[PDB]
Amino acid sequence: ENPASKPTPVQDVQGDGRWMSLHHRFVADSKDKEPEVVFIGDSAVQLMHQCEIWRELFSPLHALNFGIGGDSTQHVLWRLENGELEHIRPKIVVVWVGTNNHGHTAEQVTGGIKAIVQLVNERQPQARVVVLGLLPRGQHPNPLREKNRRVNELVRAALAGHPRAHFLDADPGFVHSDGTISHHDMYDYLHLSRLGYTPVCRALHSLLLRLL
Amino acid sequence: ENPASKPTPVQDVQGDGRWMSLHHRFVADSKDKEPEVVFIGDSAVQLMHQCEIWRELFSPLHALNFGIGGDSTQHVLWRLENGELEHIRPKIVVVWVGTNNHGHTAEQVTGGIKAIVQLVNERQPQARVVVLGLLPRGQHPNPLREKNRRVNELVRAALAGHPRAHFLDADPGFVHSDGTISHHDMYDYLHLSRLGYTPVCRALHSLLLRLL
């Protein structure tokens, strides 16, 4: 088994059950609504709903946001297999996950992302799949920057022959020529500020309108 | 040793160094500025700077925000001992930490909070200390709700005889009579939405103006 593509829930080792409460809410969302676009991934998806304005650009497109902070590829795969794609028929699914797969090689994370695209192609075969590149992270150059770069290379080459699967690099140049990322774009050098989200969401919204 | 009151940095087991980059930024903030109020704690402090509007209520008071997501009591104690209280002379320090001390009993977390108040009383003896209550968490009743309740009881009784230390319960009633917390207040049943922050910050700002 690639650990990144073996589907599993987040075990609760803390005791308030919040991960499973979020999954159950998204399951009810899919039971009760009819989205055209479904978003799923880690905190970069989740906070876009709060902290970009979702409402200007993505609410009009009839969209559900299924981001959960901390998720790896295998947790996203499990959620899509266990209720969050039921009862719906989206035109587009947007995937953004992989930066949190700590302890997995870049090759394993790529296998995780490919298994998500295949499941979506099996369960919701009418839908186009958009996969976003993993963003740079850390204030200065570091090995997770190189990891995430290698994932994006391998995922881009995997999807290149895929008629209805689209890779998007949404990075405007967060890493500057002195190697730094500024806390104005990413307040803890990982999560995007309001300002950091604007150009990311701009690039995504343009692709979405083009596909739609 | 109480683990919660033995000062230690967050070890980097991921590889991009972001925790130490945040600590070093706050150290430079204190070197270069002259705050009247310093805020320190976990993600509830950190996101108030993004996601409430800090700018309307707290920026006017000449305030620095030293929140870091994920911190326990012992990590806050270490940061205050290792540079973030140097070169400054605040009137008020606001402390908000303890919900992330998983694996520590409520009594141990209380000892952690008391060791933070004592250090601030030693290094910055002119300053009043405000400690906020730990908020409820989880969609439904659970053992971390009871834990956090017991911490607040023990901390309130510890500070009651403390002429310049102030306990504040900032909770407006997030837990409803059916036991639930709504995702409109806390989007993942732990972190506060924009809407959830308004009444919290309102209560804090009022106390601050009173003390100031």
Curated annotation (Swiss-Prot), chains A, B:
Pfam families, alphabetized: Lipase_GDSL_2
Single GO cellular component term: cytoplasm
GO function terms (MF aspect): 1-alkyl-2-acetylglycerophosphocholine esterase activity; platelet-activating factor acetyltransferase activity; protein heterodimerization activity; protein homodimerization activity
Oligomer status and interactors: Forms a catalytic dimer which is either homodimer (alpha1/alpha1 homodimer) or heterodimer with PAFAH1B2 (alpha1/alpha2 heterodimer). Component of the cytosolic (PAF-AH (I)) heterotetrameric enzyme, which is composed of PAFAH1B1 (beta), PAFAH1B2 (alpha2) and PAFAH1B3 (alpha1) subunits. The catalytic activity of the enzyme resides in the alpha1 (PAFAH1B3) and alpha2 (PAFAH1B2) subunits, whereas the beta subunit (PAFAH1B1) has regulatory activity. Trimer formation is not essential for the catalytic activity. Interacts with VLDLR; this interaction may modulate the Reelin pathway.
Record keyword Ion transport present: no
Keywords, comma-separated and alphabetical: Acetylation, Cytoplasm, Hydrolase, Lipid degradation, Lipid metabolism, Phosphoprotein
Localization per Swiss-Prot or TrEMBL: Cytoplasm
Family: Belongs to the 'GDSL' lipolytic enzyme family. Platelet-activating factor acetylhydrolase IB beta/gamma subunits subfamily.
Identification of the protein by name: Platelet-activating factor acetylhydrolase IB subunit alpha1
EC number: 3.1.1.47
Enzyme class: hydrolase
BP-aspect Gene Ontology terms: lipid catabolic process; spermatogenesis
Gene that specifies this protein: PAFAH1B3
Annotated SUPFAM superfamilies: SGNH hydrolase
Transmembrane segments: none
Active site: S43, D188, H191
Function: Alpha1 catalytic subunit of the cytosolic type I platelet-activating factor (PAF) acetylhydrolase (PAF-AH (I)) heterotetrameric enzyme that catalyzes the hydrolyze of the acetyl group at the sn-2 position of PAF and its analogs and modulates the action of PAF. The activity and substrate specificity of PAF-AH (I) are affected by its subunit composition.
Catalytic activity: a 1-O-alkyl-2-acetyl-sn-glycero-3-phosphocholine + H2O = a 1-O-alkyl-sn-glycero-3-phosphocholine + acetate + H(+); 1-O-hexadecyl-2-acetyl-sn-glycero-3-phosphocholine + H2O = 1-O-hexadecyl-sn-glycero-3-phosphocholine + acetate + H(+); 1-O-hexadecyl-2-acetyl-sn-glycero-3-phosphate + H2O = 1-O-hexadecyl-sn-glycero-3-phosphate + acetate + H(+)
Activity regulation information from UniProt: Beta subunit (PAFAH1B1) inhibits the acetylhydrolase activity of the alpha1/alpha1 catalytic homodimer.
Record's miscellaneous remark: Originally the subunits of the type I platelet-activating factor (PAF) acetylhydrolase was named alpha (PAFAH1B1), beta (PAFAH1B2) and gamma (PAFAH1B3). Now these subunits have been renamed beta (PAFAH1B1), alpha2 (PAFAH1B2) and alpha1 (PAFAH1B3) respectively.
